[PDB]
Design an enzyme around this catalytic site. Structure first.
Site, mmCIF file in Angstrom:
data_model
loop_
_atom_site.group_PDB
_atom_site.id
_atom_site.type_symbol
_atom_site.label_atom_id
_atom_site.label_comp_id
_atom_site.label_asym_id
_atom_site.label_seq_id
_atom_site.Cartn_x
_atom_site.Cartn_y
_atom_site.Cartn_z
ATOM 1 N N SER A 31 0.836 -1.191 0.000
ATOM 2 C CA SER A 31 0.000 0.000 0.000
ATOM 3 C C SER A 31 0.876 1.247 0.000
ATOM 4 O O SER A 31 2.105 1.181 0.115
ATOM 5 C CB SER A 31 -0.955 0.008 1.204
ATOM 6 N N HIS A 51 -4.162 -8.463 6.998
ATOM 7 C CA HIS A 51 -3.617 -9.358 5.988
ATOM 8 C C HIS A 51 -4.160 -10.786 6.099
ATOM 9 O O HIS A 51 -3.635 -11.693 5.446
ATOM 10 C CB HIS A 51 -2.086 -9.354 6.073
ATOM 11 C CG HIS A 51 -1.472 -8.020 5.770
ATOM 12 N ND1 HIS A 51 -0.109 -7.808 5.770
ATOM 13 C CD2 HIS A 51 -2.037 -6.830 5.450
ATOM 14 C CE1 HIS A 51 0.139 -6.545 5.464
ATOM 15 N NE2 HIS A 51 -1.013 -5.931 5.263
ATOM 16 N N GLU A 62 1.978 -9.595 12.064
ATOM 17 C CA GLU A 62 2.898 -10.669 11.856
ATOM 18 C C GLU A 62 3.771 -11.175 13.017
ATOM 19 O O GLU A 62 4.002 -10.490 13.921
ATOM 20 C CB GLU A 62 3.687 -10.330 10.606
ATOM 21 C CG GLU A 62 5.049 -9.860 10.761
ATOM 22 C CD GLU A 62 5.605 -9.051 9.570
ATOM 23 O OE1 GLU A 62 6.756 -8.780 9.629
ATOM 24 O OE2 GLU A 62 4.972 -8.594 8.628
ATOM 25 N N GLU A 108 4.254 -13.383 2.186
ATOM 26 C CA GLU A 108 5.571 -13.607 2.769
ATOM 27 C C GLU A 108 5.967 -15.076 2.815
ATOM 28 O O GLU A 108 7.133 -15.377 3.094
ATOM 29 C CB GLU A 108 5.607 -13.043 4.197
ATOM 30 C CG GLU A 108 5.150 -11.600 4.298
ATOM 31 C CD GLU A 108 3.738 -11.439 4.840
ATOM 32 O OE1 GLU A 108 2.804 -12.168 4.417
ATOM 33 O OE2 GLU A 108 3.570 -10.560 5.705
ATOM 34 N N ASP A 157 5.441 -7.855 14.578
ATOM 35 C CA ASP A 157 5.149 -6.605 13.893
ATOM 36 C C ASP A 157 3.663 -6.352 14.070
ATOM 37 O O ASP A 157 2.832 -7.042 13.470
ATOM 38 C CB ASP A 157 5.553 -6.673 12.434
ATOM 39 C CG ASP A 157 5.184 -5.438 11.676
ATOM 40 O OD1 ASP A 157 4.823 -4.406 12.279
ATOM 41 O OD2 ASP A 157 5.261 -5.515 10.459
ATOM 42 N N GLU A 195 7.669 -4.538 16.452
ATOM 43 C CA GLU A 195 7.677 -3.502 15.431
ATOM 44 C C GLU A 195 6.312 -2.817 15.379
ATOM 45 O O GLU A 195 5.271 -3.472 15.512
ATOM 46 C CB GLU A 195 8.040 -4.121 14.076
ATOM 47 C CG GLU A 195 8.189 -3.158 12.909
ATOM 48 C CD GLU A 195 8.294 -3.899 11.592
ATOM 49 O OE1 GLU A 195 7.838 -3.388 10.576
ATOM 50 O OE2 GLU A 195 8.840 -5.019 11.573
ATOM 51 N N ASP A 251 8.717 1.251 11.789
ATOM 52 C CA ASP A 251 8.481 1.036 10.360
ATOM 53 C C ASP A 251 7.564 2.117 9.800
ATOM 54 O O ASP A 251 8.028 3.015 9.091
ATOM 55 C CB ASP A 251 7.888 -0.347 10.071
ATOM 56 C CG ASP A 251 7.544 -0.530 8.593
ATOM 57 O OD1 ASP A 251 6.655 -1.322 8.261
ATOM 58 O OD2 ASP A 251 8.157 0.138 7.746
ATOM 59 N N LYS A 287 14.006 -0.089 4.578
ATOM 60 C CA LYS A 287 13.362 -0.442 3.308
ATOM 61 C C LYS A 287 13.930 0.491 2.245
ATOM 62 O O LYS A 287 13.488 1.633 2.144
ATOM 63 C CB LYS A 287 11.842 -0.304 3.407
ATOM 64 C CG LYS A 287 11.165 -1.414 4.225
ATOM 65 C CD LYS A 287 9.687 -1.062 4.539
ATOM 66 C CE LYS A 287 8.895 -2.332 4.911
ATOM 67 N NZ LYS A 287 7.642 -2.022 5.656
ATOM 68 N N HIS A 322 12.548 -6.803 3.473
ATOM 69 C CA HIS A 322 11.871 -6.936 2.192
ATOM 70 C C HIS A 322 10.648 -6.008 2.118
ATOM 71 O O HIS A 322 10.282 -5.316 3.080
ATOM 72 C CB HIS A 322 11.431 -8.385 1.989
ATOM 73 C CG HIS A 322 10.479 -8.879 3.039
ATOM 74 N ND1 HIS A 322 9.923 -10.138 3.001
ATOM 75 C CD2 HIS A 322 9.985 -8.284 4.156
ATOM 76 C CE1 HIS A 322 9.144 -10.308 4.056
ATOM 77 N NE2 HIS A 322 9.156 -9.195 4.769
ATOM 78 N N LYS A 357 14.702 -9.162 7.978
ATOM 79 C CA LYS A 357 13.458 -9.894 7.780
ATOM 80 C C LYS A 357 13.143 -9.880 6.292
ATOM 81 O O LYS A 357 13.000 -8.818 5.685
ATOM 82 C CB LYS A 357 12.311 -9.347 8.632
ATOM 83 C CG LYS A 357 11.649 -8.069 8.204
ATOM 84 C CD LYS A 357 10.401 -7.825 9.072
ATOM 85 C CE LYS A 357 9.513 -6.748 8.500
ATOM 86 N NZ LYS A 357 8.279 -6.507 9.327
HETATM 87 CL CL CL Z 1 6.829 -4.749 7.137
HETATM 88 CO CO CO Z 2 1.604 -9.318 5.861
#
Ligand code: CL
Ligand code: CO
Ligand code: CL
Ligand code: CO
Lengths: 439, 439
Positions: free
Chosen positions: A46, A164, A173, A216, A251, A300, A325, A350, A378, A401
């Site tokens: 996004s 997600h 995550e 992922e 995260d 995170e 992040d 990133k 990533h 990661k």
């Molecule tokens: Cl992320």
């Molecule tokens: Co995800």
């Protein structure tokens, strides 16, 4: 016809390829007298708001607006030709990156696109390493003033929730980190063995169809609570035989359930009990409860991307790693604010959020100079590119990661670190328990 | 210390990397005076019985028996050193492959492992192309006597069933083929657009969690019948706007529900109605009914891998493509039997089922000489390797199945064909409606 100008760069050619989610992205070939150097650009799921601009065509009639032919055109028509004419030494990453930045002439790279600029930036770095006659990670280490190469602990996505997945799980995550491994080779073995044990546990409890994977490469079974997810991971670690050598990262992506100054841990249930929403203080207590009960070493985005007070409070009470992040967005202005406020103690890196190798290294060094760690990351839309493998080794951040050990846009990075480990040879160093600060 | 023998190959080095399912596999680096050439070996989900032997360590204490250190050791300790000493011209693929075959000295490559031998074979082919000064696909075309390069129609996995999903769906996989595209670029656009439309349809009908992906990158929602799966794909093609330009392929994997001389289309329900099991004649009628109702152009493994009569019957009644996979196993002895019996009219080409480039090309040319098509194929365990992209272009077979447009072990191949398309330039040919026999 053509005439060879005898410049440092012979050719620069961009093209449209497909990322791991099936969406177009940019790839750049840069040619010097020493060969062709290829790099591709990842893409996040996004829009950030604070990121450098990813340029999409927005042609509704083709690729549903997501082709990158304009960005590709900027490289082939303008950015590439002007960089070639600049006739710069390909080992001077900073001069080339700063030339590109100045050519674009905007703060957010919104003229050419951060995806046009980054593809060249990454290919330039490979060409500079070849000119030096050293592997990419050694060149990156030089660009960063890093005197000792140390390989990272991998942080493997295993369980997914949040926006997600269709589960009740609010947090986005959960990751496993083999901090107890004695080498990167052993860390990969441990991660892959735990991953397959987790798959077996999920199949037994939730059924075979519950083992399909997300972007992922991890799983998103119909988990009800964050505690259940941690229990599931703990069970898998125990069945794999590695209890005490595997630690857990989270995260939270808490911006996604920040509503009316509170946090809604049931934000996927439209009939959510608004009296159960947690103020930042209560949410910080829940994290602290998980830290006491589970080997959690990293969290995170525990709060909203602008909830500076809650970040500063949590980073001050706890002794684990707190990763920015959505808070920092690989953006030095945000990082400087986070540093002043002591809002976090680790930068998620990133590269495509800022758009050049040089600025990425600067952001890392800014974090490092203020005592933070750095976790290379990533994006959800990845490619077969493995640059960030060399990047995390070259910066010696101690932690990356870049997916579950599943889907080769993720394994491409882990595989590349295995190649680097082999090339370094005996005596190669692995961050292990010092992953937050290897040196 | 070492002394340089001035041989054609300077170094050969194998290592263990991870495939897309998180399991070890073999990668080989081969170095000549013109550089380093790298290739990795795919792995199928299960044992064939007629395949060349994939050598696994079977060390229960590490990687659950699936490491490939013995195969890696064979390359580094024996196969590599002996090939180097042989001092063969790297453009003579056949001499090098036949040397390796004879060195192993077994019919099924069970001394070194087909995974040891193939990694060298593939890296040799890259070194030979560089020596010739041509792209890999042109070298392969030379090795095959192919005089005209034609790009393939991609066959994209979209829906999965059979033993690979918890749904009721008996048939293993459904694919979309953009035979109506006018270029490989447009075929990729069409496949990716239909894929995303299918995702949207599945999300609407089955929920967001039904859009997680399997090994190939496609979907496995809780579909009840094969007719429903075809309806779902047809709806997605219609919503995408490409009705009449997209055709459908199936891989039935009928060996997996062959029971007591019949076929059980409900073999995942333990209380299956044995009176509903289909004799081969009735199953052939069902296929024929699907062919009348849907744009189905290819059916793979419609019957058991040894049910020669049913294969010959169906291939004789129908005019669509009938693909041998479990029937032929990229094995010339099986292919010769299938040719004599007219059991099928297309060979699935899995290079790691036979284990050298040279034997793979021979198997293809055997099929071609008898009027069959050839569909180049991935394995379920893939890597970031893209060799089979060059292979399908170099052989001009007109068709490759190497995944959904999702997961970069699949996109790596499609991306490589896009690179080839760009390199060939204007006038590049795309098989299109002639995918079964481009020339
Ligand atoms: Cl992320
Ligand atoms: Co995800
Ligand atoms: Cl298959
Ligand atoms: Co399958």
């Amino acid at each position: 016809g053509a005439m060879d100008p005898e410049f440092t760069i012979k050719a620069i050619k961009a093209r449209q390829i497909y990322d791991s989610r099936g969406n177009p992205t940019v790839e750049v070939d840069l040619t010097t007298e020493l060969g062709l150097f290829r790099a591709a650009v990842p893409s996040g799921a996004s829009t950030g708001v604070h990121e450098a601009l990813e340029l999409r065509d927005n042609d509704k009639a083709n690729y549903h607006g997501k082709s990158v032919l304009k960005a590709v055109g900027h490289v082939n028509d303008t950015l590439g030709p002007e960089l070639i004419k600049a006739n710069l030494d390909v080992v001077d990453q900073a001069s080339i990156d700063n030339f590109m930045i100045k050519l674009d002439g905007t703060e957010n790279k919104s003229k050419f696109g951060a995806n046009a600029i980054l593809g060249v930036s990454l290919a330039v770095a490979k060409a500079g390493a070849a000119k030096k006659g050293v592997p990419l990670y050694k060149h990156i280490a030089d660009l960063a003033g890093n005197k000792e190469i140390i390989l990272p602990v991998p942080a493997f996505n295993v369980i997914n929730g949040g926006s997600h997945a269709g589960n009740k799980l609010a947090m986005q995550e959960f990751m496993i980190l083999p901090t107890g491994a004695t080498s990167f080779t052993e860390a990969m073995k441990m991660g892959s063995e735990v991953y397959h044990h987790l798959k077996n546990v999920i199949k037994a409890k939730f059924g075979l169809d519950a083992t399909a994977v997300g972007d992922e490469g991890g799983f998103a079974p119909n988990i009800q609570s964050n505690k259940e997810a941690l229990n599931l991971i703990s069970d898998a670690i125990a069945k794999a035989g590695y209890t005490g050598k595997i630690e857990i990262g989270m995260d939270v992506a808490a911006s996604e359930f920040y509503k009316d100054g509170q946090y809604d841990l049931d934000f996927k249930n439209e009939k959510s009990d608004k009296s159960q929403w947690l103020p930042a203080d209560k949410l910080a207590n829940l994290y602290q409860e998980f830290i006491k009960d589970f080997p959690i070493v990293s969290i995170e985005d525990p709060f909203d991307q602008d909830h500076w007070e809650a970040w500063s409070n949590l980073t001050g009470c706890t002794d684990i790693q707190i990763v920015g992040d959505d808070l920092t967005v690989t953006n030095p202005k945000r990082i400087a604010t986070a540093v002043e406020k002591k809002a976090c103690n680790c930068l998620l890196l990133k590269v495509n959020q800022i758009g050049t190798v040089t600025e990425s290294i600067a952001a890392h060094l800014l974090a490092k100079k203020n005592g933070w760690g750095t976790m290379v990351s990533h994006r959800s839309g990845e490619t077969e590119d493995s640059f960030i493998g060399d990047l995390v080794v070259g910066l010696s951040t101690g932690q990356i990661k870049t997916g579950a050990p599943c889907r080769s846009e993720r394994l491409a990075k882990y595989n590349q670190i295995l190649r680097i480990e082999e090339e370094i040879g005996a005596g190669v160093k692995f961050a292990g328990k010092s992953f937050r600060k290897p040196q």
